[PDB]
Amino acid sequence: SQQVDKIKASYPLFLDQDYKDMLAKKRDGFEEKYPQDKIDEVFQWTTTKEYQELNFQREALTVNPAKACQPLGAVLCALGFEKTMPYVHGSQGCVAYFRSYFNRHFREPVSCVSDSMTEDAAVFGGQQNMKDGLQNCKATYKPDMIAVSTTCMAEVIGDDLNAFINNSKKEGFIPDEFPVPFAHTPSFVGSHVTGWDNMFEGIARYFTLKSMDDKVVGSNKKINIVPGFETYLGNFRVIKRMLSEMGVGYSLLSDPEEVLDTPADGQFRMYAGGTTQEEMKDAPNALNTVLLQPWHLEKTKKFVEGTWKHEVPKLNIPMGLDWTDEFLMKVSEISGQPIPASLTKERGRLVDMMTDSHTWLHGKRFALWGDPDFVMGLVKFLLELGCEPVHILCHNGNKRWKKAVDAILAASPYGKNATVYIGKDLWHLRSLVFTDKPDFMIGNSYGKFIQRDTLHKGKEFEVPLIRIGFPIFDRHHLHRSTTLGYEGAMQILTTLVNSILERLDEETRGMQATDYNHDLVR
Amino acid sequence: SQQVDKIKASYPLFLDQDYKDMLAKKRDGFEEKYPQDKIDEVFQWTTTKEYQELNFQREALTVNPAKACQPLGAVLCALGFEKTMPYVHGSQGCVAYFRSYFNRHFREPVSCVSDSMTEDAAVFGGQQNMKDGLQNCKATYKPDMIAVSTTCMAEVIGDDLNAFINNSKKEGFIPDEFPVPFAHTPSFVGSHVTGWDNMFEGIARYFTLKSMDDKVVGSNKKINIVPGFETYLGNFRVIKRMLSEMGVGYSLLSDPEEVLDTPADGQFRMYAGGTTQEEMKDAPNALNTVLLQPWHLEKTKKFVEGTWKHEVPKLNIPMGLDWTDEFLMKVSEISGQPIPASLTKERGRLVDMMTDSHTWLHGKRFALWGDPDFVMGLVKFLLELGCEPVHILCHNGNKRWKKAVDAILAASPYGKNATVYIGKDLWHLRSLVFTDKPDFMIGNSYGKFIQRDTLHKGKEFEVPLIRIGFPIFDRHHLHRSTTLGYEGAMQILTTLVNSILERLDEETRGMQATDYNHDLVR
Amino acid sequence: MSREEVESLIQEVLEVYPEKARKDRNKHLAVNDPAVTQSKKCIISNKKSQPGLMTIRGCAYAGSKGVVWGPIKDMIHISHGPVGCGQYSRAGRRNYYIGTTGVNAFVTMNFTSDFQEKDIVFGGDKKLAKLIDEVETLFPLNKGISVQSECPIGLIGDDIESVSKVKGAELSKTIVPVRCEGFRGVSQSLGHHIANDAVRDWVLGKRDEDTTFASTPYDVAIIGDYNIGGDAWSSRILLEEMGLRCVAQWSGDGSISEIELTPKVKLNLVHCYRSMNYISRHMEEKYGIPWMEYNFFGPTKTIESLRAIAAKFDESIQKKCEEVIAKYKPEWEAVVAKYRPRLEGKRVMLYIGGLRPRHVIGAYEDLGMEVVGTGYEFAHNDDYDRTMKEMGDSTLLYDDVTGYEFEEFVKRIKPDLIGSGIKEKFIFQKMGIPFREMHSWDYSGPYHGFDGFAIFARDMDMTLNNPCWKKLQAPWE
Amino acid sequence: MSREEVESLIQEVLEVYPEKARKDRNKHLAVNDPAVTQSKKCIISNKKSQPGLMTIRGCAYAGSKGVVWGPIKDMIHISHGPVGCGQYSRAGRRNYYIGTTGVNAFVTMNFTSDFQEKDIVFGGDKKLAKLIDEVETLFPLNKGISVQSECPIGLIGDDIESVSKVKGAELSKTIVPVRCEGFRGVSQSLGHHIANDAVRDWVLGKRDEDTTFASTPYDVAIIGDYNIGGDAWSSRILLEEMGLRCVAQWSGDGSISEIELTPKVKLNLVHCYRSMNYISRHMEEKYGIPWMEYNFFGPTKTIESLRAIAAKFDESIQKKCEEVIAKYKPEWEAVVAKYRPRLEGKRVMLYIGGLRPRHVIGAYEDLGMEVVGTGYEFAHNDDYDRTMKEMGDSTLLYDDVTGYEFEEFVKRIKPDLIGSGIKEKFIFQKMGIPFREMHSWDYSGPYHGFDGFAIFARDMDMTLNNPCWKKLQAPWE
Numbered sequence A, B: 001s002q003q004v005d006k007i008k009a010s011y012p013l014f015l016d017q018d019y020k021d022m023l024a025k026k027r028d029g030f031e032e033k034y035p036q037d038k039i040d041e042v043f044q045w046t047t048t049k050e051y052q053e054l055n056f057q058r059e060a061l062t063v064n065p066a067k068a069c070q071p072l073g074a075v076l077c078a079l080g081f082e083k084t085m086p087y088v089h090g091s092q093g094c095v096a097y098f099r100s101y102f103n104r105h106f107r108e109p110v111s112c113v114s115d116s117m118t119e120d121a122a123v124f125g126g127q128q129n130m131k132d133g134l135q136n137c138k139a140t141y142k143p144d145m146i147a148v149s150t151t152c153m154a155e156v157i158g159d160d161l162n163a164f165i166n167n168s169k170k171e172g173f174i175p176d177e178f179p180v181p182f183a184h185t186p187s188f189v190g191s192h193v194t195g196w197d198n199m200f201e202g203i204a205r206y207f208t209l210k211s212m213d214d215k216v217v218g219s220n221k222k223i224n225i226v227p228g229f230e231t232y233l234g235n236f237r238v239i240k241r242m243l244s245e246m247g248v249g250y251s252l253l254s255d256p257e258e259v260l261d262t263p264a265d266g267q268f269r270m271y272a273g274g275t276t277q278e279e280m281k282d283a284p285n286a287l288n289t290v291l292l293q294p295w296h297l298e299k300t301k302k303f304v305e306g307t308w309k310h311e312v313p314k315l316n317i318p319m320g321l322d323w324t325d326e327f328l329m330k331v332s333e334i335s336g337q338p339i340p341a342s343l344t345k346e347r348g349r350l351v352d353m354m355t356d357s358h359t360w361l362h363g364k365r366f367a368l369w370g371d372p373d374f375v376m377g378l379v380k381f382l383l384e385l386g387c388e389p390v391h392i393l394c395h396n397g398n399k400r401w402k403k404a405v406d407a408i409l410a411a412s413p414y415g416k417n418a419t420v421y422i423g424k425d426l427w428h429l430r431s432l433v434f435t436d437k438p439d440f441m442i443g444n445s446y447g448k449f450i451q452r453d454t455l456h457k458g459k460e461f462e463v464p465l466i467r468i469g470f471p472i473f474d475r476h477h478l479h480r481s482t483t484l485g486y487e488g489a490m491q492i493l494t495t496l497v498n499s500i501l502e503r504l505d506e507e508t509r510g511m512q513a514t515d516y517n518h519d520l521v522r
Numbered sequence C, D: 001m002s003r004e005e006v007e008s009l010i011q012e013v014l015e016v017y018p019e020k021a022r023k024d025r026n027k028h029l030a031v032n033d034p035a036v037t038q039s040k041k042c043i044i045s046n047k048k049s050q051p052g053l054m055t056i057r058g059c060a061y062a063g064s065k066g067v068v069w070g071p072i073k074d075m076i077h078i079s080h081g082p083v084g085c086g087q088y089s090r091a092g093r094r095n096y097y098i099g100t101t102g103v104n105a106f107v108t109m110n111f112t113s114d115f116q117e118k119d120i121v122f123g124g125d126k127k128l129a130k131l132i133d134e135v136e137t138l139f140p141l142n143k144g145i146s147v148q149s150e151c152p153i154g155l156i157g158d159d160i161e162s163v164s165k166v167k168g169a170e171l172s173k174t175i176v177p178v179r180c181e182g183f184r185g186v187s188q189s190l191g192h193h194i195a196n197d198a199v200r201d202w203v204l205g206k207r208d209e210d211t212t213f214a215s216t217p218y219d220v221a222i223i224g225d226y227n228i229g230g231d232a233w234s235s236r237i238l239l240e241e242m243g244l245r246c247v248a249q250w251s252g253d254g255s256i257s258e259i260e261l262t263p264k265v266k267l268n269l270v271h272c273y274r275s276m277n278y279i280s281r282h283m284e285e286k287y288g289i290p291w292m293e294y295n296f297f298g299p300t301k302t303i304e305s306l307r308a309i310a311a312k313f314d315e316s317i318q319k320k321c322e323e324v325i326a327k328y329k330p331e332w333e334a335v336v337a338k339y340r341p342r343l344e345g346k347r348v349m350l351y352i353g354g355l356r357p358r359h360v361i362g363a364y365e366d367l368g369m370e371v372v373g374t375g376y377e378f379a380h381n382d383d384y385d386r387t388m389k390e391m392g393d394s395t396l397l398y399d400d401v402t403g404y405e406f407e408e409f410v411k412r413i414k415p416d417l418i419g420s421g422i423k424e425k426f427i428f429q430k431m432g433i434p435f436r437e438m439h440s441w442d443y444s445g446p447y448h449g450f451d452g453f454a455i456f457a458r459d460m461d462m463t464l465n466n467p468c469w470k471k472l473q474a475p476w477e
Ligand code: ICS
Pocket: C063, C067, C093, C188, C226, C228, C272, C274, C275, C352, C353, C354, C355, C356, C357, C438, C439, C440
């Protein structure tokens, strides 16, 4: 039943007793459900240390992973160039999934095309699909550039992208001067950040490899900035603002902030902004190149040092106080521009916010997960705040990155209780937060289920989730946030301290029971 | 007892049974406490409509007011001028309270002085305190200007500020050239915003009244902007940014953003930034003057129109979409500068966020309170979003403002269930949210107690609080936010939609009970 | 009604294409005639998508794992292959279920092989066996395992059927291999076919020799309802208010025991013909169970469906059906009285995939709304045969529409509202046109039955009449 | 040390002042000599603040309403006058209590008469009577009303005593008029005096003729503890563990019945001499009840206080006292072992209003920390007499310190840590010196007793050793 003046949707229409009686009859009559005592016992068992031992003995099964496949990152990288259509050679289901994943996170249109490979192609190859796809996409969508990445099916059958694109050009399906950079992006190897690295290296190679003769390092008096896989618009905005404040000439590469933030003014803009082809062609003439996320830009680093002959600095991601300071000092040393007073004041204001909230932040225990560079920057900032990272998980991390994070943890007294896990998934993390309970989780939306599980054990066992990272489907407009620089540190500090305070108010709201500590002023 | 490895604070050390037994024994033995059944019955009675009728029949008693007294606003206005010491003539207890109040809200040093009038002064007046205080303050803290406001005790005894300051100048306690503007700020009349208006009008009169002969309207090609009583740094910053983006010459008056946001670099700066005396002297040469919060700047409006001969526009506070559009169009018409494309894109991005979150925002019911201009701007924006303001309360509102808000509500179908209350306090609002339960409260930290009360009635009756306004003691760094312009609208929309979603996740977190609606994607 | 103008618009939109793509796409665009009964003579469906045209279609893995098998709550579904597939499909479809996740229900979880280049080079059969053992260790209350193949499993020479057989007998556990590689077929529909074949071959006949379930003359099974926003629960209550007993529902909130019990029912009610017609026909041939299609979108279709379903039974059920209709009449009448004038005369264009575009038209008409455009991502000619009678004269019909095509059609027709998926939403919101997600219901379940209609009317009114749509043009421009 | 240096620093700091202000200020600054037991020959206190000097000192209304009367839960406290006073003091002090707020407890609520112009011109006695009626209507479970006067009450000639008497007898309700106008006195300390006089005159003797309370030889009353962050609860448990019975608790978590019960108790245990010595002396003269001061800051002082308190009773209490000391010895010893190495050798400068600048010195020394400067907002000469012996030789002493004076002293001395009020904290955090808020314990759980010492040590360690203090200097500068 519904009341027209107060219509109820699925929650809480199902809570009405007619529906409860229906569901009870259904369960008791036809579901053959295990008795509730058995279910409770099994759940309690899954929260134990013995279960955690069994769970960490896993070798073949992955449960609730915390990573994606390479072509998603390749598509994100391609979206950062002016009037560029991401083109994915292979099966169309992959493109449907990529578009929908990105569409939910940014609340924005994501444009990508597929050649729709079929079972007949698996034995004859994808070259006919490639020639038709390149012709069709160029005609109907009119892109300046087409960046080609590969699905796992194309990688398994061994399609040769270079030969396919060349034959399309010799055929006349597409013009011989039309830029078609490509990259092989296997889903089985690495993750989405690896795909971003491969796509960027393919584009840079395509535009610079055969024209290095006339290139002189430092002649255009700019610095190249490579952002890596970034899902926060504010990070692009802050990096541009800091560089412009210093008066430093810069050339951002693969920047999509404009395409993923178009206004709603009555027209649909498929393309907006992006790195131009002239910028990429002139990139080897820059003073140097900075990689903002070096731990997934290794192939790009090899190309930039080997071919462009740039002496790429050893910089961490500019997250938190010390690493932002080091990034700014390196930029100043490369360009010869002093650090201006506005950035000095911004740093001082961040330090003031740190002194203001240190009493609430000190000693809090965090579990956290994400991509390697973001995870290590967050761990560094947490140590700077006097917090304790307990469980550090990076599903797509490697051994060298783990060694670097361990070194960072050893440099602080607040890292004594930290353990770093690579190759582990969110079910492992669920066991970790049950057996060694921290105060908060930091991660993406997939953590919400873990929170639910802990609340099922009890309110005193619940571990609240703090949403920082990718993807964030449940929340709205958090993709506009910033995590880099002093501005990003300020935002993250505010989020953390106010999550702590909101939890404290939740715990002290009980009248005549816990509300003696329900203070007006905190 | 305490465990050294896990020390416990008052919550939950008191929860331990030894303390519980102690408290039970204390209550049972010596408090003569009413039986818990009588307590429960009286509480349930206070949540009823009969209690609400009795509550709204109040004439003499005020419970939990939502306003402050004039000298607080006077001090805030004085803080907005360069190297200015706010001086309050009267009892020192007021200054201690003002400084403590402001210090908690901004987490920053607040400098104010008193002349410490005692009972002897209550008999023979405060002139000796005035002379010695002005001399002492100028010698010790070295201000360029001293702005004098009045405590209630000085107003009751009828101290003549002008005569006192003149006598101090003619007897060599301070130099005759030293600027000492003053204003009468009685606590009984109006509220803190009235004090801001009085202080600003006193300063403007002091610097312009006797020098109008050489003033020509529009000769300096600028627009004066008066902000009123503003506790958000982001509001000053966004006004400055938007005016600079249009390329419009402007002269902000009473801006304290720098002195309330000084960096922590190892030195204490008592003064920073602020409107200069030259700016105030040259203000009558501007093209026009804009009042950002006209409903508490009426005396300032009278002075600016009567004396400066500026045709002050009839503008609402630039909050939400329509009023920001009107403010920008009026600025463009006055200055002759077209609205640039960056602001057009910012407006489009706000509209994009509105279309993205409208399904979650539509039809939600809000109670809300604050200062008149802020309340009316928030009501306007809520109507623009398809939300329903149900209970609108402004303790320091008047009848003309109430007609303006009623007219705004009548212009939308979403205002059909709204009622506006002036002269009511937060105990009235507690009755309103019990008898006619809305979905959320919007207001300052004093609302938390109301939330607690509603949770005591039951989880299904709890009304969550959303902290927007002044003061915000419990939260950290919310004073850095913005509420004006497209930026402020974006921040407020994000806060609202994510409060709705966080409540929804709270209600659907119960495993096998309500978690069927615990969706990953919202 | 401007039939020549619709034909002219189709020609001008097709002008952009190269010759081969234009000749292919011209067959997939038609102007509706109600009188025509054979849809093959005007529109072609179920063909390969043109390359590089930004199609909306998915793959067979989405049709099998995402649509059919995933809702089964008490089974564990292993995405066999690289990590991407299961991660993008994890909990992206709102199939409502009641259970304890991670203990007895596993719908929102992602179980995956996480294949790596070694697994590609040397195969993943031993890894699959070890995975099955680990699953048995860590999730003891599971009632079955399905193995959904991704694109490499078919491309490399894996043989998951033998692993399923060997492991199944050893653990006494039902293990269902599904060959749903994404490169098979042209859309999700082949995924439906493969999933139904797996259901008949590995699950459906477990209780053929068993006769311990007590059956009644009023035993029915709901087929093809996935419980989006609890849509099946809204439909089931009505069936139980009519006196019938619902033994099973496929597959939303469904359990493996319900599937195994289905061959004992007296009637099969199939909500989605496209996903489940395969197994419905199989059960009719093998068990003698009749099946009928029904529609619970909007009061008119719901009342018609209830009366027909009751007509399949005796007079007591028909008397109960008239009581249910009489009980619910004032509620949907009030819904109509409150929301009909606000949405009256409004025009809608819908692209929803297989069953929904024809199915929801009656609900829009119940609110006085006209559906000018209907489109399908992966329907077959029989779906268009049913669609042409439902659709009005001179309206636009379109199969596997491209992004360019649909944008141009919307620009010309200028609908008041568009109902489609997540990949079109932001595109048309930036255009200034109100948009409703017709797959997830914009996270507002349910739209099915009498209770569903009240949410449907409220949602359509709140999006079409929203204040923001009047604000996309800046005052100064 | 360097007494001559500290005296020279006092002279250089005084150089800025005009002649009148400087001559008064010098009397309020001193170099400590522990041997000197008459502080009047050394320092002058309890005098009016010089005007324009940014004095920390609060008004008499803050001393009475904010400090003494506000904590009792049952009584409704009316701020009589304009709205500002009660709004700034609403729930700003953490006097903890157990109750149901708005029903039987009213501590965090602000009741005010909220005067307007007409109340100033015509008077507020009729308004006060009508207010009392409304209070009785809307809060029926209140057990008494106090009326705290603000500045205009005294200045306009309102007679609240007559209103209190008339309304009290008519409603059979205790109504306590308090003439705590801010213009009276020079500090909060005069308000303490007025509040104690009101307690003596209107509340304390209501049960002089009543003998229905059963008394024991072990009856004590805690006087002068405001339960800041539950400080009194931490102290009461120890007293209950020693065998004593705590009849009353002034005034944190206190009730009016406990105040009336205080004449029955055998001994008075006074924590804050400054605020409650007035009523303690009155009760000694009137009822023959002895009173003694104690200190529960840090393990050494609490052990000494427990032994001294037990010495007032028989041998069983002394046995229980030794048992309590033995029970708690390992916990505070572990706290010392953990935190003294982190804090050994550090120097502290403490500015607070009364008692605490001398009460907390032992707890700092228990962690190996040296107090090199201390001062009071509003202490009298007896407080400085008790202070000089508890501070080290050649340390800085300072009464009613101006904001400029304190900043210069901190710059010269360069302490490791500063304990002071909220107004001071932002200024010293900017300069890079760790700050602990003594008045509110920085919103932290109690500093009193053995349980309190653990929190105290943890809090001091975390602010002093926090990593941010090493970061105010940018690397480039
Ligand atoms: S199964 Fe089919 S695309 Fe019949 S694959 Fe698709 S939950 Fe659609 S039109 Mo998403 S044939 Fe169901 C469908 Fe219809 S996932 Fe849902 S809405 S009624």
